[PDB]
Design a binder for this molecule. Structure first.
Ligand SMILES: N[C@@H](Cc1c[nH]c[nH+]1)C(=O)O
Ligand SMILES: N[C@@H](Cc1c[nH]c[nH+]1)C(=O)O
Ligand SMILES: OCc1cccc(Br)n1
Ligand SMILES: OCc1cccc(Br)n1
Lengths: 403, 403
């Protein structure tokens, strides 16, 4: 027998599991539409070059790469943001701004799971914190659409500019991104050893509010005015109970320059539900002649499902279909087919019993596939221009009155 | 600057191109729902073993394979059917039958395009030709939903059992599948040379009707009764002008045992639009203790788009959004945000102008993103509990009357 299990660290999605995934994705799609984002996509396969950032990122360290037969260094994408930037840079001057683009790519890694799907939402060409406001609200919106509340989850919000200022007011301005990557890992003894290759860092990470950080850098330091505006806008949109300040949040990615944020469950049981931030320099580093402000987030398909399961928000939903058409016997098949065509022509989902079987087993089959209605096509009714209809969740009906 | 082009033989889908793809996929999905098929998925990455069929298939010859860091022979899937069978075999006795499963996987190759998406539709556990009838009708349905008619396209239909009988009545019963693979290629001189490593084959390929093939094997040879039933059922479903007999159609895949079929444009300008057939032995060869009848097709995303472009059936459709909310200035942002929340709460798609800009440039922006309506939020109206609304495809309105 063949190996029936999927390849290492990858998931199968038979119909039952696929209905769950599709329930999650319907939300990602519907939230994007609500928020005016436009869908895009790009090859899962990208040049390895794309991801050579040299900051010790976990995401790049764990890159699922290989060499083609032609000798080209390639990778299954570990994230989407670099692909987005390539696309943006490819368009350059022709792309109208601002742009709001989303996608739900499968992303990969090698080392546990080797794949996941990740909802990506990004705003391009918006300088102001309104971009981050909308992104954080979109993530809250999706979580709320899935049945969660602000009692279940929150979004922690910070700015890297603060640490930047503390890095700046202290000793280069060359390695702010590596430091973030290390500080993101916060085993204190281990983290400090990595930073050797500091006290103001730990202190400012532990500062508990905007007022306390305003004391450290001024009531108008770049980062203070943005956060107050951010919290003020989220407040005004009505999702104020969903967001809060947390100075320990920097994220693991090199390219964030400004506001960063992270979704979490309020019980402390799970990893981040989603993660994002402003990355105003990425496209400059890809060789863009003009700086392109950007901001966005990734929202994985696994952590959220665990949370939804824990909260009893992922009930199995069975397959449904409107009609199951049942030939009384094989002589009625042509006529049953004509009825099938009408039902489908009217926008109904409909099966016809494909195999040879007895009526009562056809009815049982109808029940098992979650049919709302069974339509029996029998000789005596057919000559009266009728079928027998029966609701499952039988009285004779004219063919025209079925739809 | 970074390489802005995608990796060799792969396609980018910026919003414009993605709208086209999504138009095609909406059809694939909606047809599957109409026909009662259930969605499933599986990893793009599969064990190379899965595809070792040793029949000289083009699809396996051109397999995008590699070795992992752990030394495991793997491949980006060249087709989906083997993945389906793995899943089916994994379930075995627990899977209720019949089952109707669909998916729209990206599939890959190495050699031109290295990737395409392919709608897959398969019926499992149905012995009779009704399976093939429904599959062929589903493909016609999708094409018709895309604007095509039976004047534009058809489906050629055959059975491999005929050639099987001619192979059987002639000299082993071990290499029927390799012969199909060669005969599928029909450069006559080249094809005959391959078959050396025959006249009844060419003759029967050139037979022009069911009556002529019935003369060669009997009015009830397995293949004759099935085809008459097939054409009779498709006729009864009302798609008789879409289908026809063609004895030269065998398809390139080793595993087809019965009825095979192929979609084509009636002008002779394009390759096959879709391709499928019955494959009643595949799961036996994977080690299933019980024979599992199966039938299905693949329907690519490229040929169909070319055809639709040629027929002027793929007009660009611009982005749309219901509302664009416009702060009169920054002081109105909080209030504009509250309005944004209401609109979205009511199921509308809505943007808010994120950047600082003048009203008339906001209105222009609204027009460019395809907004149905612009909602101006200005101080004088706001204190009257109102905004200014203006249709694009402005009169004052109470906040409650916007939805
Ligand atoms: N690529 C980021 C998410 C993101 C999208 N846009 C900005 N950030 C991640 O994987 O965490
Ligand atoms: N795998 C086939 C299509 C198919 C699906 N089911 C049966 N056949 C192909 O690539 O042509
Ligand atoms: O960002 C972590 C990550 C990247 C790719 C795949 C998986 Br699973 N996890
Ligand atoms: O069946 C031909 C095929 C397989 C995989 C990818 C592409 Br493009 N074409």
């Amino acid at each position: 027998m063949v190996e029936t299990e999927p390849v290492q660290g990858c998931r199968d999605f038979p119909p039952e599991a696929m209905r769950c995934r599709r329930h999650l994705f319907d939300v990602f799609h519907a939230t994007a539409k609500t928020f005016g984002f436009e869908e895009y996509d790009a090859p899962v396969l990208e040049s390895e070059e794309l991801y050579i950032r040299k900051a010790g990122e976990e995401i790049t360290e764990q890159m699922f790469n290989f060499i083609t037969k032609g000798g080209h260094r390639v990778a299954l994408r570990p994230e989407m943001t670099p692909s987005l930037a390539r696309l943006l840079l490819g368009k350059g001057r022709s792309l109208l701004l601002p742009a709001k683009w989303y996608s739900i790519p499968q992303c990969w890694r090698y080392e546990r799971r080797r794949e996941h799907y990740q909802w990506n939402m990004d705003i391009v060409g918006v300088k102001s914190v309104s971009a981050e406001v909308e992104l954080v609200c979109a993530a809250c919106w999706a979580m709320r659409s899935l049945g969660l509340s602000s009692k279940d989850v929150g979004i922690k919000v910070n700015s890297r500019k603060v640490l930047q200022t503390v890095v700046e007011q202290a000793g280069t301005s060359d390695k702010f991104a590596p430091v973030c990557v290390i500080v993101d890992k916060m085993p204190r003894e281990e983290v400090e050893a990595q930073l050797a290759v500091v006290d103001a860092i730990t202190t400012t990470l532990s500062l508990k509010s905007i007022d306390e950080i305003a004391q450290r850098v001024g009531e108008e330091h770049e980062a203070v005015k943005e956060l107050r505006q951010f919290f003020e806008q989220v407040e005004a949109y009505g999702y104020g109970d969903w967001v809060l300040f947390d100075a320990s949040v920097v994220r693991g990615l090199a390219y964030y320059t400004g506001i960063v944020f992270e979704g979490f469950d309020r019980e402390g049981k799970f990893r981040a539900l989603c993660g994002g931030g402003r990355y105003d320099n990425l496209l400059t580093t890809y060789g863009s002649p003009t700086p392109i402000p950007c901001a966005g987030f990734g929202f994985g398909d696994c952590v959220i499902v665990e949370l939804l399961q824990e909260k009893r928000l992922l009930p199995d939903i069975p397959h449904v279909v409107d009609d199951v058409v049942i030939p009384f016997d094989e002589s009625m098949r042509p006529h049953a087919l004509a009825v099938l065509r009408r039902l489908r022509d009217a926008g109904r989902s409909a099966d016809i019993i494909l195999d040879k079987k007895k009526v009562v087993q056809a009815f049982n089959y109808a029940d098992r596939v979650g049919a709302v209605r069974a339509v029996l096509v029998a000789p005596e009714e057919w000559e009266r221009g009728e079928v027998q209809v029966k609701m499952l969740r039988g009285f004779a009906v004219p063919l025209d009155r079925l739809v």
